[PDB]
Design a protein around this ligand. Structure first.
Ligand SMILES: O=C(N[C@@H]1CCN(CC2CC2)C1)c1cc(Cn2c(=O)[nH]c(=O)c3ccccc32)ccc1F
Length: 351
């Protein structure tokens, strides 16, 4: 083949996110049986069907015994086979179970998209498969220069917003990519001048990034249980890098992760202290802010291409009886997110 004239970092990005073995590895981490539910046998309607049964489990848990729950729990395991052998699998009878499986299904939707792109489209031996897979993302990915202004700001945002309670690792920025999804700037146009636009973090496991770069950050579908997510079905961001970096789910066995920086149009924020499982905001509100006990210093905010970057060091917010140690930002319209950068991070685990 031609050998590919993209930068080496962009080639390694494409290798990482289209890695089939990482997709398999992600599935067994959620206790899925690859023999009964292999990667190729995944589909949207079966994930959607499992979402609906989980919504039924949600309903039973909220209204109260193990007798009726058993049938709903077994229906779920029928749709998504789990690795338990000749089993009697664990009962899905609480909010934690709903949250845990809601997380699994989110990942399986994004894993399905990555695999469908891979096994879809054309096959040409003369082209480098790195270039072929790059084109499937519909996203212009450029390496950001390390001497540039935007690179310094991004490194400082990483450097200043690593929380003390997440100190079991630290982060090395390996690569900084400037990203532009096709048609997203067009989709963002109604929100481009809205007040309270902030550059915020979104972390996810590497196996979801083919989906995120192809489709954008999406909201969980109608079938998904709203009670599976703390502030319901939206797109969640943080202003602390380590809070988002935790959701990469890296480890000593897999220490390289990927994290996004997105321009999020927050507008009038519906500020909340505890769980509120909602599908729509109250009239007038553009987003939810989960109020953190700790927040970046407001006086240290810096502008990057018109957008605020809350890169101040963590200080006390003066918010008392809150569920959250750090800030949390949720939008419920996909059009309010314009993805700006993608960082490849090395996690150095001190423990
Ligand atoms: O935005 C979230 N999930 C996206 C939206 C639906 N996406 C799956 C699409 C349907 C295929 C996953 C989301 C994330 C999390 C966890 N999470 C997270 O995964 N990454 C973060 O950066 C993050 C930052 C602050 C707070 C939570 C974060 C929890 C609940 C959620 F609904």
């Amino acid at each position: 083949h031609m050998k590919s004239k993209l930068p080496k970092p962009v080639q390694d990005l494409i290798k990482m996110i289209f890695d089939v073995e990482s997709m398999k590895k992600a599935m067994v981490e959620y206790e899925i049986d690859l023999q009964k539910m292999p990667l190729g046998k995944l589909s949207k309607r079966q994930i959607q069907a499992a979402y609906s049964i989980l919504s039924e489990v949600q309903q039973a848990v909220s209204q109260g015994s193990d007798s009726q729950i058993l049938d709903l729990s077994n229906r779920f395991y029928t749709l998504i086979p789990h690795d338990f052998g000749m089993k009697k699998p664990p009962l899905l009878n609480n909010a934690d179970s709903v949250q845990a499986k809601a997380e699994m299904l989110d990942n399986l939707l994004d894993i399905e998209v990555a695999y469908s792109l891979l096994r879809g489209g054309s096959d040409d031996s003369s082209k480098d498969p790195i270039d072929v897979n790059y084109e499937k993302l519909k996203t212009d990915i450029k390496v950001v220069d390390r001497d540039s202004e935007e690179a310094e700001i991004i490194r400082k945002y990483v450097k200043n917003t690593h929380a003390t309670t997440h100190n079991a690792y630290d982060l090395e920025v390996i690569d900084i990519f400037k990203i532009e999804r096709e048609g997203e700037c067009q989709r963002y146009k109604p929100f481009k001048q809205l007040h309270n636009r902030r550059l915020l973090w979104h972390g996810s496991r590497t196996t979801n990034f083919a989906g995120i770069l192809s489709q954008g950050l999406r909201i969980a579908p109608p079938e998904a249980p709203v009670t599976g997510y703390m502030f319901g079905k939206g797109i969640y961001f943080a202003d602390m890098v380590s809070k988002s970096a935790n959701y990469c789910h890296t480890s000593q066995g897999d220490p390289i992760g990927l994290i996004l920086l997105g321009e999020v149009a927050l507008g009038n924020m519906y500020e909340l202290k505890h769980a509120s499982h909602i599908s729509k905001l109250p009239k007038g509100k553009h987003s939810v802010k989960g109020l953190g006990k700790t927040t970046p210093d407001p006086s240290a905010n810096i502008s990057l291409d018109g957008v605020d970057v809350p890169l101040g060091t963590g200080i006390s917010s003066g918010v008392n009886d809150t569920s959250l140690l750090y800030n949390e930002y949720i939008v419920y319209d996909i059009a309010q997110v314009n993805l700006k950068y993608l960082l490849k991070l090395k996690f150095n685990f001190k423990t």
